[PDB]
Structures are given as C-alpha cells and as structure tokens.
Amino acid sequence: TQYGDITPAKNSGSLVRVTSSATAGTEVSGTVLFNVRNATELPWLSGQGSRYSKYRVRYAHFTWEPIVGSNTNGEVAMAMLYDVADVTSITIERLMQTRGGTWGPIWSPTRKRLSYDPEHASLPWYLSGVSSGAAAGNIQTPFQIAWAAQSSLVSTTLGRIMAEYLVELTDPVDVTINQ
Amino acid sequence: DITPAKNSGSLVRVTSSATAGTEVSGTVLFNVRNATELPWLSGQGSRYSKYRVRYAHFTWEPIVGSNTNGEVAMAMLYDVADVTSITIERLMQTRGGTWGPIWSPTRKRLSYDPEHASLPWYLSGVSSGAAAGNIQTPFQIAWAAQSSLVSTTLGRIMAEYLVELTDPVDVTINQ
Amino acid sequence: DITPAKNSGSLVRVTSSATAGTEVSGTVLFNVRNATELPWLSGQGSRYSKYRVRYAHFTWEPIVGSNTNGEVAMAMLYDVADVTSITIERLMQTRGGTWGPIWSPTRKRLSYDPEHASLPWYLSGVSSGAAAGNIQTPFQIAWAAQSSLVSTTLGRIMAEYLVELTDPVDVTINQ
Amino acid sequence: GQQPTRQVTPVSAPAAMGTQITYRGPQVVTQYGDITPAKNSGSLVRVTSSATAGTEVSGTVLFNVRNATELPWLSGQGSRYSKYRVRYAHFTWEPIVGSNTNGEVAMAMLYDVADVTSITIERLMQTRGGTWGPIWSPTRKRLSYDPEHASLPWYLSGVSSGAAAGNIQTPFQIAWAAQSSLVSTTLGRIMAEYLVELTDPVDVTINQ
Amino acid sequence: TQYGDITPAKNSGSLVRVTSSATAGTEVSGTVLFNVRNATELPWLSGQGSRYSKYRVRYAHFTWEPIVGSNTNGEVAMAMLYDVADVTSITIERLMQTRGGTWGPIWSPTRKRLSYDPEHASLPWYLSGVSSGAAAGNIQTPFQIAWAAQSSLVSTTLGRIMAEYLVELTDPVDVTINQ
Amino acid sequence: DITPAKNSGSLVRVTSSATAGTEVSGTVLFNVRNATELPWLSGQGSRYSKYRVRYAHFTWEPIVGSNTNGEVAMAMLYDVADVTSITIERLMQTRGGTWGPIWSPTRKRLSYDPEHASLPWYLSGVSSGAAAGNIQTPFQIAWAAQSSLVSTTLGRIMAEYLVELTDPVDVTINQ
C-alpha cells in the first residue's frame, strides 16, 4: 500500500481542566473519551477526525499537570477504561484497582505516565463517527480516561490532564457527509 | 473452511431528477445480505455466519447517448449512519472518488481497501441499527448524479467482487 | 513529524461566457488555506505551520455532451501576482499546458514540479500581498475555456494531491 | 514468587525551586566558507502576572539577528552580516516564585511573524514545542528549534516592515502564556541558549 | 527529471556604464539588481527571464572594465549585497568592508574578480517577477552589485562593470501572462 | 554552451472553407524566428546564432463536437519552396502523415527525424529566399482539412518540442 493512505496526527494537548467541588473535600469524577471526534477536549484532533472515516491510536500517554501550590490539600487519580458504558461509581479507590491506575498528591506532576495498550485494541480500525449508543460508542472510541480528584479547596481548578499522542487516520471523507 | 464468492452485478439503476439539472443522490450498503442490490450474493450470505471482502471494484454504466449532459460521482463510506448531504462536489473530496460525463464509462474505478477493515470478519446478519449495521457491513457506496434529461434512467452502478465467507449456517436459523 | 494529506477534489466549476464563443479565464491558488476551492485541505492547513506539495495532478472534468463546441486549457503559474491576460493560446505555451475539446476528459494531466519549489517549506498563512502570497502558495492553476453554449456550466477542474504538513498549531492562533 | 502489584515513587516539593546562572561570555569564531558561528545565552523575557488575579498574560518573541529588544547581543552580530541561519536554539522557564504559589506557564513555537494574537495556555499546549508546568518549577523539557523544517536555507539580516519581509528575516517566534493567583508580580524569566551562523559581511550602515 | 526542464543561460555583458559626477571629485554610487528581469542592464538575459517562471544563478563573476587612460585620477569599488532594501549610504570605505569588496585605481582592469556565492542562496529558485516591494524584491532577485567611484574628471564615463554568468531558468511561461 | 529550449504551443488555428466540404490547406515553417506561430520560441531564437531540433511532436486539437463532419491531415516537408498543391490524399502519402476525423484528437503523432537533418546546426536568421530559408529552417508542417461546417474554426495544430540553441548573440545585431 502506498504512502499517504494513512495520515499520522502527532501532537499533545490539555484533555480536561479538573476543578474542585463546591463543597470542600468532595471527590469529583469524570470520564474522557479518546476520539478523533471529541471536539470539547481534543479540538486539534477533532478537526481531522471530522474529515476521515476510520482511525487507530499508535500511542497515547496521559499525565497530571498541577497548577496549584505545594500547600494544597488534594489527591488525584486516573485509569483507563475500554467500555463506553462504564461511567458510574468513579471513585479514587476504584481507579487504583483498574488498569494503569495512577494516584498521587495534587501538587505533584505525574512521573510514571499512564499509557494506551494498542496490542489489545478491540479492533484494528475505529470509526470516526458520532452515533449515540453503547455499542456504536465502543466502535468509535478505543478507550476512555477515568479520573477523580478531591481537595479542601472550593470550586478551584486544580490542574489539567495532559495527553501526548499519535493517531493514524485513514480514508478521507467530506466533513459534511461525515457526521 | 473459507469460501470465495467471486462475481459481479448491477447494484443500482440511477434515474434523472424530476427537475432537470438537479442532483439525485444515493447510498448502497455492501454486504452479503442485501437482497435488493446484491441478490446473487444474498443467496450465499444467507448460509454463512461470517465473511470479509477480498476485493470490490465499482463503476459507472451509461445507458444514454454521448450527447446527453450531466455527470456522475462515487466514493466509499464506512459508516451505515452517514446517508445525508451527499453531493457530487462532496463525493469528489472523499476516499476513492470517481467521476465523469454521464455518457462515459468510468475510467478509474472505485476499489475497496481491506488493509483498513474495521474488523477481520464481518457478520452475516440483518439486525437493524447503526452499530449492528457497521458490524455487518464493511462499507457503502455513495453516489450522486445530475442530468439535463428529466426523470429518465441514466445508467447503472456496477460491482465486481470476491468475497470470502466462513462458518456455514442453516439459512433459516441465520437471520 | 511530517504528515501526509492525500486526497482529491473539485477546484472550480467553469461556466460558459455570456457571449457565445467568447473565452472565460481564471486562476486558482494552490495552498492549504484555500477554503473556497480546497475546503477539505483547509481543515488541515489550519492546524499546521508549514507544508510542501509532494505531488499534484490536475484534470478537466466535462459535464457537457460530445456534441458541444469549444475547448479548455490549463497551465501552472508560480507567481500570485500574475492573474491577467490569461488566454488559451497563451496557456498552451506555458509550463504543463494541457488542452482538448470541452466534452473530452483531459488525456495528459497537469502535474506539479517539486524539483523546482521556490522554497523547502511553504507557510500555512493567510497574509495578503504578493510576497506574502508567494511564501504561502507553491503555485497556481491558470485556465481558460470557450464554448458555443451560453452561460452554461461546462465542467470542473479536478485535483489529486499528496501534501506533507509539519509543525502543528492551534487553529485559532494560526491565522 | 510473583511480580510487584504496584509501583511506588516518593515525591516531594521544596519551599522554593530555582536556578543561579553565571554568564561566561559569548562565543564567536570565524571559519572557512563565509560561515561564522555566534553562540550565546541570556534572558529572553521577564514574565509578569496580570493585574487581574488568575488572568492569563501572553506574548511572542521574534528570533532575529536584528531584534535589538530581546536579542541585543545578537543584534550586534546581525548588523554586520547579510544572511544567517539558526544551528540550534533552546528556551527554558526559570521561576522567581516559591512553590507555595498557584499558577502555570507554557510556551511553544510559531513560524509566521503574523500569528501574534489569541495566544493562550490551552492553545500553546497543542502547538509544536509545547512545554508547560506549575509556575513555581523550572521547566523540565526544553523548547528547541527544528532547523530541518526551516522554510529558508538562509534567512536575511534585514529590518523591512512587511509581514512577508518579516518571515524572510525571521525563522521563528516564541509564543508563551502564563497565569497566576499573584497580582502584577514578575513570575519568572525565559532563558535562551542558541547558536547561529552569520554569513556575507556587510558594512553596518548599509545593512539597514 | 528529464533534459530540458532546466535551461542554462550562459553569457556575459556590460552591467552598467559608470560615469563621473558633474562636480569634480564627488563619489558616485549605484546598485544593480541581478535579475532575469532587469532589462536595462541585463538585456540579453531579460529577454528570457520574461518567458520563464523561476530561475537560479549557477555562477556570476563581476569585473571592472576601464575605458580611461593611465593618467586618470580615480578609484572604484564593488561589493555584493543580498537585501534589496540596502540602497543607501553606498560609499567606497563601506563597500571595502562588505563581502567581496574590491577596490582599485580607475585605469586598472580588475584582477581578482568578484563572485556570487550560490551555496548561500536565500532560496533554491528565485521568481521571475516584477512585483514592487522589499520582500517581493528579495524573492525575485538573489543579490545586487553595489558600486561607487570618484574622479577629478567631470561628467565623463570612466568604464563599465562587466558580468560573466550562467543562470538556469525553469518553467516556461507566456511572455504576457508573466509580468 | 548548448541551451535546450523545451516547450509547447499552438502553431495554427484551422478555419473551415467558405464552401462546405471544400479543403483548406496550409504550411508552417518550423524555426526559432517564426514570431507568428512560434512566438515563445522567437524570443530565444532572436538571441542565439545557431540551433537544431532535438525533438518535435505535432498533433491535432479539436474545438468541434463529435458530430461534425470532415477530416484533417499533416505531414512533414523539408523544403521551404514546396507550399503548393497540398491536399489530404497527398499528405497521406508523405513522411509522417497523420490523420483522422476532425473532432478526434490525433492518435499517432507527427515527429521530427533528426537522424536526417540536412545540416548539424541551422542558422537563426530571417533572410528571404528559398535557400536562405532551407538553411534557417529544418522542416515545415503541411496540413489540409475539410469540413461540412462553413467558415468556422475547426481546431489548432499543436507542437511540443525541445530545441538546442548555441552561440549567443545580441538581439539587435542578430536579424
């Protein structure tokens, strides 16, 4: 197969901004879908997912980016999920029991990054689509990043979750038709 | 253990718009259980659990004279969901886009790219729904055409394929 | 570190002159940020600082019947400044000139010559001006056509390319 | 028996992190060809907090042999040569604040003298060269120039006003953005070590 | 790439006629752009620049051609510039400090010729154009020849500046469109 | 020391006879100083003393629809003197004869045979006379055409060449 058939998208960026609960010390959870179509958290990537039919993730590393001082009193955790249907009960003690679970103090930048395991992809090429539904979801997104944090600080942004990746897109499509 | 089904056939017959010059668009699902456009193949799909496409080539087949005006276009889609907003200009910027005058037999052909199958073996099923559809259909052919003629049949979209089927199943159960 | 964007698309749609037999000319800038004629590509150009063209092939796409009179012509220009005095006879004596009856799909194609790029990597920018333009655009397609028909759309100018982009940039900043 | 179940890593933060820097002097040498390598280092920008707490502050720097504002030393060299090119250039963040402080910083590379608006942290993070981190800590990964992708084999030592003229005289720019709970306080500086090759001498008076 | 794609233009010719100031002993300056489009000083070359899109200079040597006797009292100087914007303050003492600067007595034909340095070209292929402006200028012309002379003689032509070159043109264009 | 000038262009535009079906004939001198049909080249010929043709290919370029009647023909002549009695039937029995329906782009092309140049290097001159002409022109293209249409322009005769020039000369002197 010739050159060009696969287009690599290598870049990084802020996945999400993690901000504390309005009630001091209350865990805050979240789940982020890794898509070429998640325009909210993967803008740069989304602008391309939209113009290609299929895609696959070559590699993706996630890390915690703190933006609060050393005296802050919080904790953070991340793990990788592979079922779009898994969206509840995201607690810290649970992420610490699921694949890649990384926990640490709020002020500390992640040392041992969390990474995608491609050799276990549920399928060769995922679809650049938006069809709602659990099944449809798992066929359009390879994995998700579950996270949970907590802090005595009230309604303050603690930091972000960074992502350094490289994904390959294939089969160009018209932005409009492709939706 | 793996059976190859090699054949060809007419997928669809394209008819001019009621309003001259206006575009007519469409989309065809490529699978072993598409009785409407891939009849011959359906007789096979009906008796095997899984399958995958080895190769598939699509072309334009004219019925009109070289004088007729208008043009055709085709491209490949890989999502049962996308079936709207199809137009020549758009198909032209889509994977595999072929085109040309309506009276002329397509030069370059539209071919399937197995290297990027979303999955090794697709299901010979008929379940409804977007997902259920993407699991049963490797791809679809999007097409659009327009002609100065009115409500006349311009031509057909042709298909030449080789499909590998596997895991035989009683036709009645498999549905 | 270098991303290839391979695709095709319709650049322009050429329409007959108000005065039959009279020539209609035009010029298309080839770059990653040309939303008008290279839409699909623009979505890429918008998110990369630099780029360069690996290969690009242009052709004539007829919409009219083989009976129609007139002819088309294309050539490559390498200066955003030159946009006047374009005529068939002239394009024919310009680098890469292709031509032929209006109803006929171009035989030989117009191809890009990277061996002579004015520079290694062009900027994905939108600044106005001749210079700023030559720094952002590797070349343009000049075309001219004439037909016995009146104010009718003759055909489209097609493009097939492979572009290598580099140095990603946030879409908002890059403008 | 089996392998470990987890991996523990001790982490710690000091009251304040920083860096002392002693200037050793610029390095210049004439060589065969017309080539003459200029090597130097220093402060690029003095990054100071927004008057409105928590608000983002930003900006960009042109890498020029004739940018008397931020690269004064380099200007002296630029004024005497006609052309040049960058061998390497690395930029880095240096904190003046205690680890107690809140905020973050980020920087990346741009290649069009015209792109100088809408600079923000979240946006620099998705731009090539993106580096970032809590404001109080020196930047681990540095920002380096990529000369293999230069648009010009040799850039010009000129000062013409255009946007194009600017891109013909500048190989790249440093975008940066930061925010902090502190108000109108100088957060830190962006340092730079680089090496450029000047060529084709010219009387300074004329080179303008 | 095949034969013919690049057309070599090898020749020489008079660049400029250097004539003295109306006021005895006053330095006279000048700048000459090396273009396939400078019809005033590079006629032979210009007639081709006009019919090609791009071009590059393989080599170019400049020399002083005196046409006044040994008893004449003057001096001449040349140097090479690479910024079209550099056009003022052209004095002899300054050319003698810029690249290739050659100075000598008026009656004496240049011995050590001044030459273009291609390995330092700002760009691979220059444009055969005329768009005014500094930037546009530097993209259409690779370099210029700055010169200055002076002599007790009044308003008399001292000599010429010769040029022996070889430039390669590429991408034919219609003479009219190309402007 | 030897410069190659590679390009193409329109030589002549052929127009139908006043009397339908009647033949229209013509002949084009191929040289570096033919401002009328080889303009671009003239700008080169004007500044070189000698030259020789590396390769030259001529073709028919239609402007009419596939319905139009009539035919075209071309052949190569090697004597400035011969310009009379040109007719299709005759060109067909002459070296390099190409032909075909008027609306159809020539299949086989007319090519120059350098192996038999009457001389190594031809002069870039403009002197009048048969001899003076044969010394300055390596060959000419004879053509003839006829069509059912009346006084309409049928098409153009195209040329693609590579010419080697030598011994530069000031344009003014060289004439």
Place of tokens 């559809």: B133
Of B65, B92, B107, the CB nearest to C9: B92
Burial class (CB in 10 A: 0-12, 13-18, 19+), C61: buried
Of C7, C39, C65, the CB nearest to B68: C65
Which residues, 6 or more positions from F129, have their beta carbon under 8 angstroms from its beta carbon? Answer: none
With residues binned 3-state (H G I as helix, E B as strand, rest as coil), the percentages for chain E, rounded to 5, are 10, 40, 45
**Which has the closest alpha carbon to C102: C143, C165, C137, C154?**
C154
Q: Are D184 and D51 in contact (CB under 8 A)?
A: yes
Question: Which residues are bridge partners to D132 per DSSP?
Answer: D106
> Which residues of chain C lie closer than 8 angstroms to A43, CB-CB?
170-171
In whole angstroms, what is the distance from residue C39 CA to residue C45 CA? Answer: 10
Whether B and D touch (3+ CB pairs < 8 Å), yes or no? no
Cα dihedral B96, B102, B104, B107 in deg (nearest 10): -10
Burial class (CB in 10 A: 0-12, 13-18, 19+), C87: middle
> Which residues of chain A lie closer than 8 angstroms to D99, CB-CB?
69-70, 107
Structure tokens given for C6? 């391979």
In whole angstroms, what is the distance from residue F2 CA to residue F124 CA? Answer: 14
* Kind and range of the H or E run holding D77: helix D72-78
In whole angstroms, what is the distance from residue D60 CA to residue D76 CA? Answer: 22
Q: What are the backbone angles phi and psi of residue C18, rounded to the nearest 5°?
A: -65, -35
Please give, one letter per residue, the 3-state secondary structure of chain F. CEEEEEEEEEEEEEECCCCCCCEEEEEEEECCCCCCCCHHHHHHHCCEEEEEEEEEEEEEEECCCCCCCEEEEEEEECCCCCCCCCCHHHHCCCCCCEEEECCCCCCCCEECCHHHCCCCCEECCCCCCHHHHHHHCCEEEEEEEEECCCCCEEEEEEEEEEEEEEEECCCCCCC
Q: Are F62 and F167 in contact (CB under 8 A)?
A: no
Q: Are B35 and B42 in contact (CB under 8 A)?
A: yes
Report helix, strand or coil for F114: helix
In whole angstroms, what is the distance from residue F78 CA to residue F117 CA? Answer: 9
Of B113, B129, B134, the CB nearest to A171: B113
Do E174 and C77 count as a contact with CB atoms less than 8 A apart?
A: no
Residue C97 has, within 13 A of its CA and on its CB side, a CA count of 29
Q: Are A100 and A79 in contact (CB under 8 A)?
A: yes
**Which has the closest alpha carbon to C124: C65, C80, C175?**
C175
Structure tokens given for E24? 């005895």
Please give, one letter per residue, the 3-state secondary structure of A101-136. CEEEECCCCCCCCEECCHHHCCCCCEECCCCCCHHH
Place of tokens 């391979």: C6
Distance of CA E152 to the CA centre of its chain: 25
In whole angstroms, what is the distance from residue C73 CA to residue A58 CA? Answer: 44
Burial class (CB in 10 A: 0-12, 13-18, 19+), F135: middle
Using CA atoms, how far residue D181 sits from A105, C170, D176, in Å, is 20, 26, 18
Q: Are C12 and C142 in contact (CB under 8 A)?
A: no
* Amino acid residing at B95: R
State the DSSP code for B116. G
Structure tokens given for B21? 């010059």
Place of tokens 């015209």: D114
**Which has the closest alpha carbon to E124: F40, C119, F50?**
C119
Of E3, E5, E44, the CB nearest to F168: E44
Which residues, 6 or more positions from A40, have their beta carbon under 8 angstroms from its beta carbon? Answer: none
Structure tokens given for A60? 């993706």
Strand E126-127 and strand F23-30: the pairing is: unpaired
In whole angstroms, what is the distance from residue A50 CA to residue A39 CA? Answer: 9
In whole angstroms, what is the distance from residue C109 CA to residue C98 CA? Answer: 6
> Which residues of chain E lie closer than 8 angstroms to F47, CB-CB?
44, 47-48
Place of tokens 């982490």: D11
Domains and CATH numbers, chain C: 1-175 (2.60.120.20)
Nearest-neighbour CA in chain B from A85: distance (Å): 14
Q: Are F26 and F17 in contact (CB under 8 A)?
A: no
Q: Which residue of B has its CA nearest to C12?
A: B89
Structure tokens given for C128? 């106005």
Nearest-neighbour CA in chain C from E114: distance (Å): 26
Report helix, strand or coil for D73: helix
Nearest-neighbour CA in chain E from C66: distance (Å): 30
**Which has the closest alpha carbon to D208: D75, D102, D110?**
D75
**Which has the closest alpha carbon to C9: C79, C78, C57, C63?**
C57
In whole angstroms, what is the distance from residue D186 CA to residue D196 CA? Answer: 30
**Which has the closest alpha carbon to E161: E18, E9, E21, E35?**
E18
DSSP string of chain C, one letter each residue: -EEEEEEEEEEEEEE--SSTT-EEEEEEEESTT-TTT-HHHHHHHTTEEEEEEEEEEEEEEE-S-TT--EEEEEEEE--TT--SS--HHHHTTSTT-EEEETTSPPSS-EE--GGG-SSSSEE-----SHHHHHHH-SEEEEEEEEESS-S-EEEEEEEEEEEEEEEE--TTT--
> Which residues of chain C lie closer than 8 angstroms to A167, CB-CB?
none
Place of tokens 């103090």: A105
Q: Is C114 left (phi over 0), alpha (psi -120 to 50) or beta?
A: alpha
Q: Are F70 and F165 in contact (CB under 8 A)?
A: no
Structure tokens given for E72? 């004449």
Question: Which residues are bridge partners to E148 per DSSP?
Answer: E29, E77
In whole angstroms, what is the distance from residue A139 CA to residue C87 CA? Answer: 53
Q: Which residue of E has its CA nearest to F163?
A: E4
State the DSSP code for B114. G
Using CA atoms, how far residue D56 sits from A18, B66, D98, D174, F23, in Å, is 18, 65, 19, 16, 81
> Which residues of chain D lie closer than 8 angstroms to E90, CB-CB?
206
Neighbour tally for B20: CB within 10 Å: 14
Report helix, strand or coil for B120: coil
In chain C, residues preceding a discontinuity (C to N beyond 2.5 A) are none
**Beta strands in chain D, from DSSP E residues, in sequence order:** 27-28, 36-48, 57-62, 81-95, 103-110, 131-134, 143-144, 155-156, 173-180, 186-201
Whether C and D touch (3+ CB pairs < 8 Å), yes or no? yes
Q: Are C7 and C41 in contact (CB under 8 A)?
A: yes
Touching C (3+ Cβ pairs <8 A), the chains are A, B, D, E, F
Neighbour tally for A179: CB within 10 Å: 17
Which residues, 6 or more positions from F146, have their beta carbon under 8 angstroms from its beta carbon? Answer: F17, F21, F22, F23, F24, F70, F71, F88
Strand E102-105 and strand C122-123: the pairing is: unpaired
Q: Which residue of E has its CA nearest to F10?
A: E174
Do D126 and A43 count as a contact with CB atoms less than 8 A apart?
A: yes
> Which residues of chain D lie closer than 8 angstroms to A111, CB-CB?
9, 11
In whole angstroms, what is the distance from residue B9 CA to residue B40 CA? Answer: 8
Which residues, 6 or more positions from E121, have their beta carbon under 8 angstroms from its beta carbon? Answer: D153, D154, E56, E57, E142
Report helix, strand or coil for F153: strand
Do D104 and A13 count as a contact with CB atoms less than 8 A apart?
A: no
Q: Are D195 and D63 in contact (CB under 8 A)?
A: no
Do D115 and C174 count as a contact with CB atoms less than 8 A apart?
A: yes
Picking from C87, C99, C149 by the largest number of F CB atoms within 10 A of its own CB, the best residue to mutate is C99
Nearest-neighbour CA in chain A from C133: distance (Å): 25
What does the buried/exposed string (b/e) look like for C161-172 if buried means 16 or more CB atoms within 10 Å of the residue's CB?
bbbbbbbbbbbb
What does the buried/exposed string (b/e) look like for E67-91 if buried means 16 or more CB atoms within 10 Å of the residue's CB?
ebeeebebbbbbbbbbbbbbeeebb
In whole angstroms, what is the distance from residue C28 CA to residue C42 CA? Answer: 14
Neighbour tally for F48: CB within 10 Å: 22
* Kind and range of the H or E run holding B11: strand B2-15
Using CA atoms, how far residue E137 sits from D168, E37, E132, E140, in Å, is 11, 11, 6, 5
* Amino acid residing at E175: V
Q: Are D71 and D63 in contact (CB under 8 A)?
A: yes
Radius of gyration of chain E (CA): 17
Structure tokens given for B137? 């259909």
Structure tokens given for F22? 């009647």
Structure tokens given for A3? 């050159």
